[PDB]
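Exercise 7. Predict the joint structure of the components listed below.
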Amino acid sequence: FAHLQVSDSETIDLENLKVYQKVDYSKTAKPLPLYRECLKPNTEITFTVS
RNA sequence: ACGAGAACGCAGCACCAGCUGUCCAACCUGAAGAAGA
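Solution:
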């Protein structure tokens, strides 16, 4: 990884953001108080790795 | 009633002229703002 060379992401539209709540899997889907800002699905992101 | 008396070893003269404290050298290497149930 000392020779792996990854870059930062490119321009991302502000419209592609959303707020989601954590969901569980233990015997049910229990809502959680933690809400976080997330990019919506189906969003293109550009990188550059060498 | 002295081989003695008198007599500045003194006068003018820049330790001064030329000369980069310079040349070469990444503040660099590795690291998920992330996870219970």
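Discussion. Residues 1-2, 24-27, 30 of chain A lie near RNA strand B (CB under 10 Å from a C1').
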